Design a protein around this motif. Sequence first.
Motif, PDB file in Angstrom:
ATOM      1  N   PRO A   1       8.610   6.986   5.975  1.00  0.00           N
ATOM      2  CA  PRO A   1       7.401   7.367   5.206  1.00  0.00           C
ATOM      3  C   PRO A   1       6.470   8.331   5.956  1.00  0.00           C
ATOM      4  O   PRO A   1       6.009   9.303   5.353  1.00  0.00           O
ATOM      5  CB  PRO A   1       6.723   6.015   4.933  1.00  0.00           C
ATOM      6  CG  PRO A   1       7.895   5.045   4.867  1.00  0.00           C
ATOM      7  CD  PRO A   1       8.784   5.515   5.990  1.00  0.00           C
ATOM      8  N   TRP A   2       6.266   8.135   7.279  1.00  0.00           N
ATOM      9  CA  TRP A   2       5.399   9.001   8.081  1.00  0.00           C
ATOM     10  C   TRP A   2       5.983  10.402   8.288  1.00  0.00           C
ATOM     11  O   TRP A   2       5.296  11.262   8.857  1.00  0.00           O
ATOM     12  CB  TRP A   2       5.052   8.361   9.431  1.00  0.00           C
ATOM     13  CG  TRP A   2       6.236   8.018  10.290  1.00  0.00           C
ATOM     14  CD1 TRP A   2       6.811   8.798  11.258  1.00  0.00           C
ATOM     15  CD2 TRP A   2       6.932   6.765  10.316  1.00  0.00           C
ATOM     16  NE1 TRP A   2       7.856   8.119  11.850  1.00  0.00           N
ATOM     17  CE2 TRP A   2       7.927   6.855  11.317  1.00  0.00           C
ATOM     18  CE3 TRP A   2       6.794   5.566   9.609  1.00  0.00           C
ATOM     19  CZ2 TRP A   2       8.791   5.793  11.613  1.00  0.00           C
ATOM     20  CZ3 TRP A   2       7.677   4.529   9.872  1.00  0.00           C
ATOM     21  CH2 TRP A   2       8.669   4.650  10.856  1.00  0.00           C
TER      22      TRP A   2
ATOM     23  N   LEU B   1       8.333   2.566  -5.353  1.00  0.00           N
ATOM     24  CA  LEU B   1       7.839   2.726  -3.973  1.00  0.00           C
ATOM     25  C   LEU B   1       8.072   4.146  -3.465  1.00  0.00           C
ATOM     26  O   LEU B   1       7.164   4.770  -2.933  1.00  0.00           O
ATOM     27  CB  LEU B   1       8.515   1.699  -3.022  1.00  0.00           C
ATOM     28  CG  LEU B   1       8.018   1.705  -1.573  1.00  0.00           C
ATOM     29  CD1 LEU B   1       6.520   1.537  -1.490  1.00  0.00           C
ATOM     30  CD2 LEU B   1       8.761   0.679  -0.711  1.00  0.00           C
ATOM     31  N   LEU B   2       9.282   4.659  -3.674  1.00  0.00           N
ATOM     32  CA  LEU B   2       9.665   6.004  -3.274  1.00  0.00           C
ATOM     33  C   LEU B   2       8.804   7.041  -3.978  1.00  0.00           C
ATOM     34  O   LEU B   2       8.298   7.923  -3.302  1.00  0.00           O
ATOM     35  CB  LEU B   2      11.161   6.235  -3.546  1.00  0.00           C
ATOM     36  CG  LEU B   2      11.750   7.567  -3.101  1.00  0.00           C
ATOM     37  CD1 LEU B   2      11.669   7.758  -1.594  1.00  0.00           C
ATOM     38  CD2 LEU B   2      13.162   7.692  -3.527  1.00  0.00           C
TER      39      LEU B   2
ATOM     40  N   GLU C   1      21.889   1.422  -8.595  1.00  0.00           N
ATOM     41  CA  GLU C   1      20.983   0.356  -8.168  1.00  0.00           C
ATOM     42  C   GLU C   1      20.578   0.532  -6.713  1.00  0.00           C
ATOM     43  O   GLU C   1      21.352   1.056  -5.915  1.00  0.00           O
ATOM     44  CB  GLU C   1      21.643  -1.018  -8.348  1.00  0.00           C
ATOM     45  CG  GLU C   1      21.786  -1.436  -9.797  1.00  0.00           C
ATOM     46  CD  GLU C   1      22.301  -2.853  -9.946  1.00  0.00           C
ATOM     47  OE1 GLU C   1      23.539  -3.030  -9.974  1.00  0.00           O
ATOM     48  OE2 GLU C   1      21.469  -3.787 -10.014  1.00  0.00           O
ATOM     49  N   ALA C   2      19.361   0.073  -6.369  1.00  0.00           N
ATOM     50  CA  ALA C   2      18.808   0.133  -5.033  1.00  0.00           C
ATOM     51  C   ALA C   2      17.802  -1.004  -4.818  1.00  0.00           C
ATOM     52  O   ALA C   2      16.983  -1.298  -5.690  1.00  0.00           O
ATOM     53  CB  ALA C   2      18.156   1.477  -4.782  1.00  0.00           C
ATOM     54  N   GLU C   3      17.890  -1.651  -3.643  1.00  0.00           N
ATOM     55  CA  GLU C   3      17.002  -2.737  -3.246  1.00  0.00           C
ATOM     56  C   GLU C   3      15.986  -2.231  -2.270  1.00  0.00           C
ATOM     57  O   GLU C   3      15.017  -2.933  -1.993  1.00  0.00           O
ATOM     58  CB  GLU C   3      17.795  -3.920  -2.634  1.00  0.00           C
ATOM     59  CG  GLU C   3      18.592  -4.736  -3.656  1.00  0.00           C
ATOM     60  CD  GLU C   3      17.810  -5.723  -4.504  1.00  0.00           C
ATOM     61  OE1 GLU C   3      17.552  -6.839  -4.000  1.00  0.00           O
ATOM     62  OE2 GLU C   3      17.461  -5.392  -5.663  1.00  0.00           O
ATOM     63  N   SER C   4      16.195  -1.005  -1.737  1.00  0.00           N
ATOM     64  CA  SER C   4      15.353  -0.361  -0.719  1.00  0.00           C
ATOM     65  C   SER C   4      15.385   1.141  -0.868  1.00  0.00           C
ATOM     66  O   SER C   4      16.292   1.660  -1.539  1.00  0.00           O
ATOM     67  CB  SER C   4      15.869  -0.731   0.663  1.00  0.00           C
ATOM     68  OG  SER C   4      17.182  -0.226   0.858  1.00  0.00           O
ATOM     69  N   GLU C   5      14.421   1.863  -0.219  1.00  0.00           N
ATOM     70  CA  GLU C   5      14.383   3.329  -0.253  1.00  0.00           C
ATOM     71  C   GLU C   5      15.612   3.896   0.462  1.00  0.00           C
ATOM     72  O   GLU C   5      16.167   4.900   0.017  1.00  0.00           O
ATOM     73  CB  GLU C   5      13.112   3.866   0.409  1.00  0.00           C
ATOM     74  CG  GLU C   5      11.830   3.586  -0.339  1.00  0.00           C
ATOM     75  CD  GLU C   5      10.604   4.095   0.377  1.00  0.00           C
ATOM     76  OE1 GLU C   5      10.426   3.763   1.571  1.00  0.00           O
ATOM     77  OE2 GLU C   5       9.796   4.794  -0.268  1.00  0.00           O
TER      78      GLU C   5
ATOM     79  N   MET D   1       0.864  -1.178   0.000  1.00  0.00           N
ATOM     80  CA  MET D   1       0.000   0.000   0.000  1.00  0.00           C
ATOM     81  C   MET D   1       0.899   1.225   0.000  1.00  0.00           C
ATOM     82  O   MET D   1       1.804   1.321   0.827  1.00  0.00           O
ATOM     83  CB  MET D   1      -0.922   0.008   1.229  1.00  0.00           C
ATOM     84  CG  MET D   1      -2.061   1.001   1.133  1.00  0.00           C
ATOM     85  SD  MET D   1      -2.973   1.078   2.674  1.00  0.00           S
ATOM     86  CE  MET D   1      -3.906  -0.469   2.610  1.00  0.00           C
ATOM     87  N   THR D   2       0.681   2.145  -0.928  1.00  0.00           N
ATOM     88  CA  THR D   2       1.517   3.348  -1.019  1.00  0.00           C
ATOM     89  C   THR D   2       0.650   4.585  -0.673  1.00  0.00           C
ATOM     90  O   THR D   2      -0.322   4.447   0.077  1.00  0.00           O
ATOM     91  CB  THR D   2       2.177   3.414  -2.415  1.00  0.00           C
ATOM     92  OG1 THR D   2       1.147   3.513  -3.406  1.00  0.00           O
ATOM     93  CG2 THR D   2       3.046   2.198  -2.707  1.00  0.00           C
ATOM     94  N   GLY D   3       1.018   5.756  -1.214  1.00  0.00           N
ATOM     95  CA  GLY D   3       0.301   7.010  -1.005  1.00  0.00           C
ATOM     96  C   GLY D   3       0.220   7.435   0.447  1.00  0.00           C
ATOM     97  O   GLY D   3       1.051   7.027   1.253  1.00  0.00           O
ATOM     98  N   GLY D   4      -0.804   8.228   0.768  1.00  0.00           N
ATOM     99  CA  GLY D   4      -1.049   8.806   2.083  1.00  0.00           C
ATOM    100  C   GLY D   4      -1.126   7.827   3.235  1.00  0.00           C
ATOM    101  O   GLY D   4      -0.588   8.099   4.304  1.00  0.00           O
TER     102      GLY D   4
END
Length: 358
Positions: free
Chosen positions: A353-354, A295-296, A335-339, A182-185
């Motif tokens: 994210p918050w 995702l980012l 390259e990136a596997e994560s944010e 789940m992304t966004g807000g």
Amino acid sequence: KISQYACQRRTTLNNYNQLFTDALDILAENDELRENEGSCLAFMRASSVLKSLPFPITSMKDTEGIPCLGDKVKSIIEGIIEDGESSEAKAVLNDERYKSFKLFTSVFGVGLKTAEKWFRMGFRTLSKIQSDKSLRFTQMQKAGFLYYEDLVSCVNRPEAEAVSMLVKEAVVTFLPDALVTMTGGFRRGKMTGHDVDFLITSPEATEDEEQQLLHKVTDFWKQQGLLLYCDILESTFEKFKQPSRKVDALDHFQKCFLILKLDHGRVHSEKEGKGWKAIRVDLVMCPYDRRAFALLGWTGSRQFERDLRRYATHERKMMLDNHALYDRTKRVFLEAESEEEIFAHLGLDYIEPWERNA
Ligand SMILES: O=C(/C=C(\O)C(=O)O)/C=C/c1cc(C(=O)c2ccc(F)cc2)c[nH]1
Ligand code: NA
């Protein structure tokens, strides 16, 4: 020292300056409607920085050392300190063009050009638009009017969770190794939203399997009688293209804009009617190796994304978008596997994210 970049600030949902930022957000929205991009951007950056403050502004002295606060913005802050309200934002709220544009674009499928067209035809209410026998509506607008009351009501977290369950159940039926996020807000900690967005990726799926998933999942929901609206945008993604230079980068991944039928029985909340609710849902499918960039980009906020890309370009000579990160000095894609790895590549402290509610 507060940075001018939202990507170097922590912006949480405990906003202590809502009196100021609600007024600045209204003035910025009006400048968007009046096609004044520059004035819009100035109010958005001022609003964004005040949202990051750990205390409320209670005097003009409190604005010392805060960046992105021009003379026009400081006059608005002064006026709110004076009488508790913004005379400028109050005039926008009472403006007939602003009221019409907000009301008309609150319908799914109605944008700036259609809202402007209806206003210049003399329409002021949704009742008069819907009942008009000369007007022609797009399939998106028909759905927007049919499910208007449900779509205008806020999606809460028990509903977003109920939608997440539906998405995951459908996706794993065709791709059991798929990762659904789940992304966004809601990812940024919001209690409510106008829609529920998801990022889907699979480590073992082929290029064809990953192209067919959104078609399979929506056909399954259509068969089950849960698909109220569906528009699938095919991917225009280019594996070896340099990332976007644009202020607001376009997403080229395969995606779909949906309206799903959410049965009340699937919602596990504290709490009638038809027994179901229409929910706006967006699904995005991306190649596994680009999952951190997607995702980012989809987590947001819109201001956080704009400043991330601006910082990458102006401070690091890097090009960032939802699909990739390119280093212009090293002449290599990173390259990136994560944010976390994307933030580390950019020389930024990781922002949770918050903390991206800029
Ligand atoms: O709400 C905000 C921003 C404000 O609140 C603010 O900056 O103040 C955005 C959240 C957000 C953005 C999206 C998109 O829909 C999206 C993203 C990328 C793209 F290419 C196309 C669509 C999902 N999360
Ligand atoms: Na709209």
